[PDB]
Amino acid sequence: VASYDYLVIGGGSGGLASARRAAELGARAAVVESHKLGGTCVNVGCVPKKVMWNTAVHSEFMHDHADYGFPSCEGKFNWRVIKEKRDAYVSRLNAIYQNNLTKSHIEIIRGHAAFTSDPKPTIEVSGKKYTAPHILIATGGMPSTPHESQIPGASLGITSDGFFQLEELPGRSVIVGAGYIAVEMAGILSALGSKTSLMIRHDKVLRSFDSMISTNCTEELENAGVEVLKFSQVKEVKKTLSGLEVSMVTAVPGRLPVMTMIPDVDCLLWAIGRVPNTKDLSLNKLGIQTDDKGHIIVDEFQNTNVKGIYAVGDVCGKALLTPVAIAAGRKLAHRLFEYKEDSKLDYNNIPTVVFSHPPIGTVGLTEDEAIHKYGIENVKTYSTSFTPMYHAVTKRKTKCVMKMVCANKEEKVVGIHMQGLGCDEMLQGFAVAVKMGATKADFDNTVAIHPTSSEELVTLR
Amino acid sequence: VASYDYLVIGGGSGGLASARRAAELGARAAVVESHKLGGTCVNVGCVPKKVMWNTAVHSEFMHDHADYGFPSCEGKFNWRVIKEKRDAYVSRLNAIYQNNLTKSHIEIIRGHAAFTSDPKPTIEVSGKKYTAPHILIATGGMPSTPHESQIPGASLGITSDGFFQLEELPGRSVIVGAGYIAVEMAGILSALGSKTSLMIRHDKVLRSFDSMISTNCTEELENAGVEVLKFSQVKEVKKTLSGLEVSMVTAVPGRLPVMTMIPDVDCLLWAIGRVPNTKDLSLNKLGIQTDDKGHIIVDEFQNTNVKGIYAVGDVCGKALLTPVAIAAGRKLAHRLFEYKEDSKLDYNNIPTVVFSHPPIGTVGLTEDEAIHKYGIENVKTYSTSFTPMYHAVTKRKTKCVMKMVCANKEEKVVGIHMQGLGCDEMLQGFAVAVKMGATKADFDNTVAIHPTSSEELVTLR
Ligand SMILES: Cc1cc2nc3c(=O)[nH]c(=O)nc-3n(C[C@H](O)[C@H](O)[C@H](O)COP(=O)(O)OP(=O)(O)OC[C@H]3O[C@@H](n4cnc5c(N)ncnc54)[C@H](O)[C@@H]3O)c2cc1C
Ligand SMILES: Cc1cc2nc3c(=O)[nH]c(=O)nc-3n(C[C@H](O)[C@H](O)[C@H](O)COP(=O)(O)OP(=O)(O)OC[C@H]3O[C@@H](n4cnc5c(N)ncnc54)[C@H](O)[C@@H]3O)c2cc1C
Ligand SMILES: *SC[C@H](NC(=O)CC[C@H](N)C(=O)O)C(=O)NCC(=O)O
Ligand SMILES: *SC[C@H](NC(=O)CC[C@H](N)C(=O)O)C(=O)NCC(=O)O
């Protein structure tokens, strides 16, 4: 059994960041990876998605070309051109990440890891055994798909993974789901030219976001040409002579359910959830706790119920974001190797950007969460709605909505929510301010930058 | 003599903001304006400039169209189309601002104001006299032009004001100056298709900015096709049969001066400075102090040397920005009408964005200013340089440069400087953090937003 100071299972965002920071502190570390380094963020997540988003943003601006004094641009988008360039970029990143591991002297064990029934925590990769006093599970998650038992023909649809393998733009697509991944996919496919429908169980998307955002986002999707099919779900999917045919049931409250058929669908994309990657780890061999969804249970320091075993990232099921897995992975390295016992990630005030059109930026509490935590009498909100100056000369329009949630007498800023052009790069700094405990006066005392959209947040009254 | 509680001379950014906040506090106010309400910001400044910048940004993205999988866009830009739409937008704003004054019950006295030799401060507009216990001078400034005595034919060139009256795109243009206005004009004319040259007295533009920015900005201008004529100045300008001919002297240190002729110039734009608007106020009648440039001298509370007379905005010559005139105007209203004697604007940490290509964002101290204030041993800087992800698939490239200036042991963030895509909307929030006294650890403890450019500022090592 080869011994190390730190054994990391999973070469994605959390696993890499932790192994690297540990190595910097002197730990002899090894990372086990059964696929491609960079994990979801590089291969089928953040990076390829962002490239596709920039492409979709290009299509929208092309629509405004004539308004800006130029001749109109025709429009024929060529999917495989960008797909090939996107794949190439991802290839460059995998090479870079591998190089980063080698330069830090981190061993890479290629293959699938599973725990053994050995007393002291030990794993086995391809017949070989490895052990360490500290083992991190950072195996991430997968897209969830419906079972053929409940939805016949569900397997005819693809997930976000399959979206990244598409070689042609689907002519007609139906996305099922109301979370951010669903919204992003719908927004990209629609901007690029696919006749798109988004099927949600209720009446709005992103229902866990502040209500101002769920409402505004649902309206912008419709204004952009996405058909939002409300109170609907898939009953069955079948392969016809040309495409797929989706049978859905729409059940609006106060009306009778109606069954509809959606024919000639080229692409059915399930964006209903993520499942943790833990089934083949043999967690049960060591008695590591998991919830009923398969997530590994951890305390505030990322400890599992077994000493010397930790877990970070998507596998834990909380705050499923790349920067969160990274920060939790690094804080863990410092606790274990720099002996900083108070080193852990604060899961409050984690900022998020949803790459919709326009993009969404959020940090802190929604109005309801603040109301429930401080009480109505102690919660004051400020908001604004306006048309960005960029649209002063265009026929096409989008809006910018901003909301500030303040708590107590001092009006401590506990939440910022916004949607609009530029919101994707606007959030980071305000997130720093909110993490510091800024009050509305701190915002009000900062001189504005004119003309920008960002200045509206420091001039709210 | 009609009496008021507050008489404001000038209907621009500072004058309007102050009059409005005063009216909200109960003051009977009147604003004197000899031209168009909204002043420079609306008519020949921020607003028309931003529209032209968005247009120039459109031209740059059109260049990347084919790289993004679309068919190429031809290119013939039509200047008068956007000019007409821009003028219309400015018309809408003037109407809005006038409405805002009427709804606040602020009287608008149309005309040119001048002080009288009356003992108690009194002004006269078109034969009629007006007085108040508090009079604010917010007359702004003008573009500076060379004298025909020193530069013969200087009057053949235009200023930024004249730039906004152009009805056609000049085929060949020469901009003289190295400040932000010069850089902005050069960037817009060049992106729109004019063969552009920028004539500067030294070797870099924006010399008063952090050195990383002056250098980077000079390089980006050249990379974008602007001919930067270094160590050069205009000696004479003459009207030829077709355009203008500019005689310039280039005097590089360590070489002999060389005289050059620039022929067939369609547009010569002077962007050398701003002069205060104070000559026709008869300041001398009350003995109000001014410097040798004509700026009105004021203390930290915007008081002049005469009781009951104040001055804010460009006329004072410090921090010539729209938001500064506004904030100083409002703080003044609170001091005088809400009796908050400690109400005044803090001129430290004022953020600025220069709409170049890519845009520049700056707040706080440059590396040299920090070195001089804390001493080399106490100044630590962190910086990064990278190519935005947007260019991962394009042949055309721009860079993103960021620098953080920290002071003392705690590494207090005293300055942030950056240039790159998205930097125009990225600054506001970090400005709030810096105004609050954030340290590098405050930045480091905020979870990053991936993938964005803004996340680089919270992950500097
Ligand atoms: C479509 C999509 C878009 C997203 N967009 C964003 C975004 O814009 N911003 C953002 O912050 N987040 C985004 N996310 C979420 C983000 O990608 C994840 O939160 C992050 O990748 C989780 O990192 P991780 O380390 O927990 O897991 P992963 O990155 O998934 O890494 C797990 C790695 O472990 C490996 N592995 C699993 N089991 C084993 C085993 N037994 N032995 C060996 N190797 C194993 C896997 O191959 C994988 O490489 C997106 C996700 C998706 C799918
Ligand atoms: C090309 C250009 C681009 C700029 N871009 C930016 C930018 O992007 N961001 C930014 O923050 N700043 C920018 N500025 C600077 C900004 O416009 C000024 O700082 C701001 O307008 C100053 O406001 P003010 O109230 O001091 O003066 P002004 O806005 O000039 O207002 C003065 C007003 O007083 C009136 N007036 C003068 N004398 C009299 C008199 N005797 N009687 C009656 N009325 C009188 C004038 O007609 C004028 O309307 C730019 C400036 C220019 C020229
Ligand atoms: S897309 C893969 C992830 N990249 C990042 O999020 C960049 C991280 C920042 N540059 C940073 O915090 O340093 C990821 O897997 N990152 C791995 C890493 O160790 O940076
Ligand atoms: S372009 C004219 C100026 N407008 C602004 O800068 C907007 C100000 C902000 N919305 C704010 O601080 O409220 C200007 O002249 N503004 C006049 C005003 O009173 O807002």
Side-chain angles (χ1 to χ4, degrees):
Chain A
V1 193
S3 232
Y4 290 87
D5 292 312
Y6 200 40
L7 246 184
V8 175
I9 305 173
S13 291
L16 298 184
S18 203
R20 290 178 57 193
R21 184 58 53 89
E24 300 187 357
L25 296 174
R28 168 58 182 125
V31 167
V32 189
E33 171 59 59
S34 49
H35 301 285
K36 296 171 179 174
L37 295 170
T40 295
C41 183
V42 174
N43 304 290
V44 293
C46 305
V47 180
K49 183 276 293 291
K50 189 66 189 287
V51 174
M52 296 310 289
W53 186 77
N54 283 324
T55 304
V57 167
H58 232 292
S59 192
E60 300 178 346
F61 288 161
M62 163 187 60
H63 295 327
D64 306 340
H65 214 49
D67 282 325
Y68 266 103
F70 295 88
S72 298
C73 233
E74 53 181 300
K76 192 204 84 287
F77 170 68
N78 191 326
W79 185 282
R80 77 190 336 272
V81 169
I82 207 65
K83 190 221 176 208
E84 291 166 343
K85 295 186 180 187
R86 195 191 75 218
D87 281 351
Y89 180 39
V90 162
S91 286
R92 297 198 294 276
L93 294 182
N94 300 131
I96 285 180
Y97 281 110
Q98 188 168 346
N99 182 229
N100 285 167
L101 285 205
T102 63
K103 288 191 299 181
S104 292
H105 320 115
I106 294 157
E107 188 119 64
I108 303 168
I109 306 172
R110 253 77 73 160
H112 169 82
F115 289 98
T116 58
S117 40
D118 281 335
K120 66 165 190 293
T122 300
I123 68 173
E124 180 185 280
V125 193
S126 294
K128 305 243 268 188
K129 294 190 173 182
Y130 307 91
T131 184
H134 304 283
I135 299 173
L136 171 70
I137 305 172
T139 48
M142 307 170 251
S144 179
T145 47
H147 275 270
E148 212 74 1
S149 58
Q150 81 161 76
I151 295 180
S155 64
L156 292 169
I158 61 173
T159 62
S160 52
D161 289 355
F163 171 86
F164 290 119
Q165 296 189 229
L166 290 185
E167 295 189 54
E168 313 289 338
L169 170 81
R172 178 74 171 103
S173 21
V174 174
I175 296 92
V176 181
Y180 87 97
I181 293 178
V183 176
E184 285 180 348
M185 303 288 92
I188 288 160
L189 283 168
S190 184
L192 296 182
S194 192
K195 168 108 288 177
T196 308
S197 292
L198 180 58
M199 204 188 297
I200 62 179
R201 298 195 58 122
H202 300 257
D203 62 321
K204 286 161 181 170
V205 293
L206 302 176
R207 299 194 316 117
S208 63
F209 283 51
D210 183 271
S211 74
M212 175 189 80
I213 299 307
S214 42
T215 302
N216 191 77
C217 192
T218 308
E219 307 188 334
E220 286 288 19
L221 276 165
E222 297 188 293
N223 291 337
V226 179
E227 178 182 54
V228 184
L229 302 173
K230 301 159 177 177
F231 295 102
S232 315
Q233 64 190 42
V234 175
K235 187 197 167 297
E236 176 181 15
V237 180
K238 68 164 209 165
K239 182 51 189 163
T240 63
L241 284 169
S242 308
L244 301 170
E245 185 170 84
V246 183
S247 300
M248 62 157 187
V249 178
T250 300
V252 177
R255 298 181 80 177
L256 294 169
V258 45
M259 246 260 253
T260 303
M261 234 66 61
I262 307 179
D264 308 317
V265 171
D266 296 305
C267 168
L268 173 62
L269 196 162
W270 297 114
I272 62 171
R274 304 278 304 167
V275 46
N277 232 312
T278 58
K279 192 239 290 292
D280 296 290
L281 284 170
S282 301
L283 291 173
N284 58 277
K285 279 177 174 295
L286 290 170
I288 296 156
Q289 253 187 275
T290 53
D291 60 11
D292 54 8
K293 303 298 183 174
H295 296 117
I296 289 165
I297 308 296
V298 299
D299 70 4
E300 62 207 312
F301 294 106
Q302 314 295 151
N303 295 302
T304 66
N305 59 308
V306 180
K307 285 164 185 169
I309 304 185
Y310 321 86
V312 300
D314 285 12
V315 81
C316 291
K318 66 146 71 181
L320 307 191
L321 297 166
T322 275
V324 178
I326 288 175
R330 291 179 178 159
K331 288 287 186 171
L332 178 57
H334 285 280
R335 177 168 74 84
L336 307 181
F337 299 110
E338 189 165 25
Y339 305 98
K340 288 180 172 167
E341 58 171 332
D342 68 305
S343 190
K344 64 172 174 54
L345 172 69
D346 177 24
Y347 287 81
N348 293 121
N349 300 145
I350 287 170
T352 311
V353 161
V354 174
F355 291 97
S356 43
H357 301 268
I360 290 160
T362 184
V363 63
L365 303 178
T366 68
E367 184 168 9
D368 291 349
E369 297 174 321
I371 277 167
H372 180 256
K373 183 180 171 183
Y374 304 101
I376 301 274
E377 76 260 35
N378 298 316
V379 162
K380 178 57 188 294
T381 61
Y382 296 89
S383 60
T384 192
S385 191
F386 61 99
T387 299
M389 187 172 166
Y390 168 80
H391 292 296
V393 302
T394 63
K395 285 166 187 173
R396 179 180 71 99
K397 309 280 182 172
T398 59
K399 203 189 301 175
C400 181
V401 298
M402 288 166 178
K403 175 148 113 189
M404 185 186 279
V405 186
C406 297
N408 302 143
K409 184 226 298 81
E410 68 269 10
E411 295 198 333
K412 178 173 173 179
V413 181
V414 302
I416 292 174
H417 314 285
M418 56 186 171
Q419 181 167 13
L421 285 177
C423 291
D424 54 317
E425 295 290 354
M426 204 184 293
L427 193 64
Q428 193 75 80
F430 289 116
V432 178
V434 172
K435 181 65 176 279
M436 280 173 66
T439 67
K440 173 80 154 52
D442 286 325
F443 276 61
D444 290 3
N445 280 317
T446 305
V447 170
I449 301 167
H450 185 68
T452 61
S453 286
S454 66
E455 72 175 301
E456 296 300 310
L457 268 187
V458 294
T459 60
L460 285 170
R461 277 188 112 214
Chain B
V1 193
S3 232
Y4 290 87
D5 292 312
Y6 200 40
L7 246 184
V8 175
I9 305 173
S13 291
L16 298 184
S18 203
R20 290 178 57 193
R21 184 58 53 89
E24 300 187 357
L25 296 174
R28 168 58 182 125
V31 167
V32 189
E33 171 59 59
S34 49
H35 301 285
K36 296 171 179 174
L37 295 170
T40 295
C41 183
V42 174
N43 304 290
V44 293
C46 305
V47 180
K49 183 276 293 291
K50 189 66 189 287
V51 174
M52 296 310 289
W53 186 77
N54 283 324
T55 304
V57 167
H58 232 292
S59 192
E60 300 178 346
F61 288 161
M62 163 187 60
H63 295 327
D64 306 340
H65 214 49
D67 282 325
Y68 266 103
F70 295 88
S72 298
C73 233
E74 53 181 300
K76 192 204 84 287
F77 170 68
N78 191 326
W79 185 282
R80 77 190 336 272
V81 169
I82 207 65
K83 190 221 176 208
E84 291 166 343
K85 295 186 180 187
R86 195 191 75 218
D87 281 351
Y89 180 39
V90 162
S91 286
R92 297 198 294 276
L93 294 182
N94 300 131
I96 285 180
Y97 281 110
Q98 188 168 346
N99 182 229
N100 285 167
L101 285 205
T102 63
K103 288 191 299 181
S104 292
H105 320 115
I106 294 157
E107 188 119 64
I108 303 168
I109 306 172
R110 253 77 73 160
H112 169 82
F115 289 98
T116 58
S117 40
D118 281 335
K120 66 165 190 293
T122 300
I123 68 173
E124 180 185 280
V125 193
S126 294
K128 305 243 268 188
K129 294 190 173 182
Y130 307 91
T131 184
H134 304 283
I135 299 173
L136 171 70
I137 305 172
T139 48
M142 307 170 251
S144 179
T145 47
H147 275 270
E148 212 74 1
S149 58
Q150 81 161 76
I151 295 180
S155 64
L156 292 169
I158 61 173
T159 62
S160 52
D161 289 355
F163 171 86
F164 290 119
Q165 296 189 229
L166 290 185
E167 295 189 54
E168 313 289 338
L169 170 81
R172 178 74 171 103
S173 21
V174 174
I175 296 92
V176 181
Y180 87 97
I181 293 178
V183 176
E184 285 180 348
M185 303 288 92
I188 288 160
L189 283 168
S190 184
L192 296 182
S194 192
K195 168 108 288 177
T196 308
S197 292
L198 180 58
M199 204 188 297
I200 62 179
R201 298 195 58 122
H202 300 257
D203 62 321
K204 286 161 181 170
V205 293
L206 302 176
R207 299 194 316 117
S208 63
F209 283 51
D210 183 271
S211 74
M212 175 189 80
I213 299 307
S214 42
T215 302
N216 191 77
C217 192
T218 308
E219 307 188 334
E220 286 288 19
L221 276 165
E222 297 188 293
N223 291 337
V226 179
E227 178 182 54
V228 184
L229 302 173
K230 301 159 177 177
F231 295 102
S232 315
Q233 64 190 42
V234 175
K235 187 197 167 297
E236 176 181 15
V237 180
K238 68 164 209 165
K239 182 51 189 163
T240 63
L241 284 169
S242 308
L244 301 170
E245 185 170 84
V246 183
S247 300
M248 62 157 187
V249 178
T250 300
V252 177
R255 298 181 80 177
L256 294 169
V258 45
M259 246 260 253
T260 303
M261 234 66 61
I262 307 179
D264 308 317
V265 171
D266 296 305
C267 168
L268 173 62
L269 196 162
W270 297 114
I272 62 171
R274 304 278 304 167
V275 46
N277 232 312
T278 58
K279 192 239 290 292
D280 296 290
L281 284 170
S282 301
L283 291 173
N284 58 277
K285 279 177 174 295
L286 290 170
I288 296 156
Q289 253 187 275
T290 53
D291 60 11
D292 54 8
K293 303 298 183 174
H295 296 117
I296 289 165
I297 308 296
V298 299
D299 70 4
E300 62 207 312
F301 294 106
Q302 314 295 151
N303 295 302
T304 66
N305 59 308
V306 180
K307 285 164 185 169
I309 304 185
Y310 321 86
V312 300
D314 285 12
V315 81
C316 291
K318 66 146 71 181
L320 307 191
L321 297 166
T322 275
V324 178
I326 288 175
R330 291 179 178 159
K331 288 287 186 171
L332 178 57
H334 285 280
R335 177 168 74 84
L336 307 181
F337 299 110
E338 189 165 25
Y339 305 98
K340 288 180 172 167
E341 58 171 332
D342 68 305
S343 190
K344 64 172 174 54
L345 172 69
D346 177 24
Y347 287 81
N348 293 121
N349 300 145
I350 287 170
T352 311
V353 161
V354 174
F355 291 97
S356 43
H357 301 268
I360 290 160
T362 184
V363 63
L365 303 178
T366 68
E367 184 168 9
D368 291 349
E369 297 174 321
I371 277 167
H372 180 256
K373 183 180 171 183
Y374 304 101
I376 301 274
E377 76 260 35
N378 298 316
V379 162
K380 178 57 188 294
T381 61
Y382 296 89
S383 60
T384 192
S385 191
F386 61 99
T387 299
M389 187 172 166
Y390 168 80
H391 292 296
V393 302
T394 63
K395 285 166 187 173
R396 179 180 71 99
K397 309 280 182 172
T398 59
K399 203 189 301 175
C400 181
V401 298
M402 288 166 178
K403 175 148 113 189
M404 185 186 279
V405 186
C406 297
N408 302 143
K409 184 226 298 81
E410 68 269 10
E411 295 198 333
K412 178 173 173 179
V413 181
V414 302
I416 292 174
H417 314 285
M418 56 186 171
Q419 181 167 13
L421 285 177
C423 291
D424 54 317
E425 295 290 354
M426 204 184 293
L427 193 64
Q428 193 75 80
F430 289 116
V432 178
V434 172
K435 181 65 176 279
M436 280 173 66
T439 67
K440 173 80 154 52
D442 286 325
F443 276 61
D444 290 3
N445 280 317
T446 305
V447 170
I449 301 167
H450 185 68
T452 61
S453 286
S454 66
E455 72 175 301
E456 296 300 310
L457 268 187
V458 294
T459 60
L460 285 170
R461 277 188 112 214

